[PDB]
Design a protein around this ligand. Structure first.
Ligand SMILES: Cc1cc2nc3c(=O)[nH]c(=O)nc-3n(C[C@H](O)[C@H](O)[C@H](O)COP(=O)(O)O)c2cc1C
Ligand SMILES: Cc1cc2nc3c(=O)[nH]c(=O)nc-3n(C[C@H](O)[C@H](O)[C@H](O)COP(=O)(O)O)c2cc1C
Lengths: 216, 216
């Protein structure tokens, strides 16, 4: 039951470095990242999946500064996912997306494909041209991917923690992201908690629905 | 299996108005909204859940004008969730959150509670004082809730569609949201698809991992 998964998952504070994802789970987490929904199927994202000691150490340099409490989590987890957003929405990317929708068989006609593209360009143009907020818009889609991911990995039986406490400038510099048209937003270590994970045995806490929720 | 759910879920384009959530499912979707993670457990959100004909019609007013293709989804679904973000992060809210964490039993000591609050205020202040991006930050947390929600409701056996194609100004005006300190971001109708849902039988399309995903 998915509600059980939602009530029992927790942000892991310490990982067991000896406990790896199975090779199958390593495929499955990639499936989760790929198949997340996004506004217009824009998919304005890149993922770095660090599973080696060298890879994880490159990521963990971003947990300099006031972010040392997060450094261990990045080193000790099995797999570490960096969620990145595109920095700008370009026409090359929009063509890639609609051509993929076509290859996958989503259009009965050429007309239907043209209309999909006109629809997507119109909607994207609203963000880059009029509102000038396309970076924020694309970032939101990435956070949506994260949310999907966290419940997904919980449902697979894996521990994880979302991390905003890192220096994106360091991480971007380390993987040359700016030059490739991306910026890091969230880091998610995935694995199995250790005995040092104090949050594993703490009760979960949320505001009551009588504050956060209205029915009409 | 959650990977099946991820591969088979789809944005519903048409709902069957005669098919309601069971009383139990109506509680479960609320549990999903409530128990989503958020940066610092800040929970900077409000949900409107419209299940009556009057309520759903009020929401659907936001889809008149240029967004008519989305209007019928909001009218015909069983339950329609409006995801709202806070417009500003205030100290009253931060106190509410940490006091709830305390009531739920997450602190062994007064010291531990003080440290949690200092930690959260420090991190929040970084967004409101420096950066001046706390609206964007809070909105991202809400999108993360959406991502969690969409996989959740799919895993419960329910159909849904995320909607950004609505007029937030109209929706905010209709529920007096600005005055209460919120803004609408995403509308999610939940229910069961009708035979008019052309997207139910279309193959899913994603960009290949050799573009979106790097391993290290
Ligand atoms: C976007 C985001 C950023 C977070 N950043 C961190 C972080 O840097 N360090 C950390 O220990 N936890 C981090 N958390 C975990 C949250 O504090 C956590 O989800 C919240 O306290 C509720 O805990 P739960 O995940 O156990 O339900 C983050 C959560 C989210 C959603
Ligand atoms: C944030 C967001 C906004 C969306 N807005 C709309 C919308 O206004 N109308 C609509 O029909 N679908 C909307 N969609 C659905 C997307 O087109 C869809 O997720 C994408 O094509 C992938 O297909 P799938 O959701 O069936 O996996 C939205 C999706 C998301 C995540």
């Amino acid at each position: 039951d998915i509600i059980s998964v939602a009530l029992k998952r927790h942000s892991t504070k310490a990982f067991d470095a000896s406990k790896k994802l199975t090779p199958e789970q390593a495929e499955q987490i990639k499936t989760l990242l790929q198949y997340s929904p996004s506004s217009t199927n824009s998919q304005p994202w890149h993922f770095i999946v660090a599973s080696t000691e060298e890879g994880k150490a490159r990521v963990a340099k971003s947990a300099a500064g006031n972010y040392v409490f997060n450094e261990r989590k990045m080193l000790d987890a099995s797999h570490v996912v960096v969620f990145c957003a595109k920095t700008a929405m370009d026409d090359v990317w929009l063509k890639l997306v609609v051509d993929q929708e076509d290859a996958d068989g989503r259009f009965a006609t050429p007309e239907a494909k043209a209309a999909n593209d006109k629809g997507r360009k119109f909607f994207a143009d609203m963000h880059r041209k009029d509102l000038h907020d396309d970076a924020e818009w694309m970032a939101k889609q990435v956070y949506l991917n994260v949310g999907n991911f966290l419940l997904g990995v919980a449902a697979l039986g894996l521990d994880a923690v979302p991390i905003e406490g890192f220096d994106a400038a360091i991480l971007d510099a380390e993987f040359g992201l700016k030059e490739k048209g991306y910026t890091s937003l969230v880091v998610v270590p995935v694995g199995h908690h250790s005995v040092e994970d104090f949050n594993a045995t703490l009760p979960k806490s949320r505001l009551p629905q009588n504050i956060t929720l209205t029915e009409v």
